[PDB]
Structures are given as structure tokens and as C-alpha cells.
């Protein structure tokens, strides 16, 4: 190991945001502070210096962005209420309003968040697990944080994957959420503009480890067409990938790369098959320098392989 790697929490929360190829990765250090590492052609940051707040140790870590002009990052306080670190261009890091709502959630609750797609309006949707084990949606629509739809019961401490996209033929954003149920299945819930939240749950994986990490993206939205990728950590100590391709549906899944037992996961994407892509970047812990975060890479030219071994500060 190194001193840098040694600062990264074992089984830390990982989130990432991007504006095409420019990337930020979010994690928790061993002291409870949330840090940002940074790629604009070269890796950098992650240090004591690049801290954007504190959260309880073992806290989930979720993040979503509007390019890199708006970033929002979500963790749990020491009182297990949801909080938010915000970044706008020209303003920097600050404390978002979410913490002032004091939304109590299960202390084992996970988080996901998305900016709603195909608008310039800053509209946000955070997903978390209340103490009764239901998945609650929290909305920001410019008029304050307020509770939204409850999507139901899941496994206590289930992973929560989220993504949004806009069908170019339709009038508003779609949202797709993925979590784990009591029976250990992994399931999807779906929201479409024309129809709100559909009532049915779709199964995507039959049995996964209890509380396995779940992380999701989508890209290449067209007319009534989309592509999605879901990732989780399966019983064999690896990330597996579930594919939704337009025209194929849920047509494929398998293993991608090894991870440490219980490792967390984050995924970002950009581009499309239609325009010399897509690009996919995965972040996890696989034991590099013991505790360092590692990267896995997809692009159309170079294909699929491990990217940066040991993210900063390692």
C-alpha cells in the first residue's frame, strides 16, 4: 500500500459524475470526510485538500450532475438524515438545502440520485430507504424538497441504482430504479412521462448477495429507444453486468471484473453507438494497493479492459 491508498475507506461509498470524458469520483476517507478525485486528461486530487464535507462513517455516497456545471452529492449525517454537498460553476462547494428537511432514513439505507433528463431546469430525484424498508422518492423541482412517490419494500440495506433519460419523441424524462427485494431478487421499477410510475416490478437478476452494491446508467436515447447497463456484485466476488439493448431488452448478463468482498460500485457513461461510442467507466475496490479505488474502461476503439489501477490519492 501507500499512505494515499491507506486513507481510502475499505468498502467505501463510490459515486462518479461526468461531462463526456471529464470525470469526478466521490469517496469517503478513513476519517469520515468525503473527497473528490478528478480526471481532465490526467488523474489528480483525492487528498485531504479536496474534501467536500463529512458524513457518518460507512455512509452511502451518491452523486449526479448536469455536465460539470452542476454537481450534487448525497450522504447520511450522523443522525441518519439525508444531506447534500452542492457545486455550481462560479460558486464552488457548499451545503445544499436537503439537510434542513431532516429526512430520517434507516441507518443502513443506501442512496441514489439523478438529475432529470432532457430539461435545463434543475430537477432532482433522490432515492432512499426509510426505516420501514420502503424506497422513498424525494423531489426537488425548484419549490423545496418534498417527499414524492413510495416505490415499496426492499431488502433492508438494499443497493439502489438509478438513471434517467429522455425519449426524444416524448414530453418529459424517464426514470428507472433498481433494488433488491426480500427474496434476494434484483428488480427494476420504471417511470415514463406519458404514464407515471408503472405498477409492475420487472426482475433483472434472480438471486444476488444480501445488500449487494447496485449501480446503473443509460445512454443513446432515441425515439422510444434507449440503452441501459446495470451492475452489481455477485456471489463470486465480481461485478456482473446486466444489459438492456433497444431491440433486445434484457438480453444479456455476465461477469466483468473481480472486486474485493463487499466492494461498492459506480458507473458513468456518455456518447452512443450512433456516434463512435459509447464510453463506460466503472469504479470499485479490487484490492489494488489494498484499499485504492480501481477503474474499469469501455470504449469502442480500445474495447474493454482495466483502466487506472489506483485512483488518487493512492
UniProtKB/Swiss-Prot annotation:
One Pfam family name is Fungal_lectin
Query: What's in the keyword line of the UniProt record?
Result: Lectin, Metal-binding, Repeat, Zinc
Q: List ligand-binding residues for alpha-L-fucose 6.
A: 43, 281, 295
Residues at which alpha-L-fucose 5 binds: 229, 241
Q: Which residues bind alpha-L-fucose 3?
A: 125, 137, 149, 197
Described by its record, this protein's role is as follows: Multispecific lectin that is able to recognize L-fucose in all possible linkages. These could be found not only in decomposed plant matter in soil, which is the natural environment for A.fumigatus, but also in various epitopes on human tissues. Mediates binding of A.fumigatus conidia to airway mucin in a fucose dependent manner.
The record's family statement is: Belongs to the fungal fucose-specific lectin family.
Q: How does it assemble?
A: Homodimer.
Name the UniProt record assigns to this protein? Fucose-specific lectin
This chain's source organism reads Aspergillus fumigatus (strain ATCC MYA-4609 / CBS 101355 / FGSC A1100 / Af293) (Neosartorya fumigata)
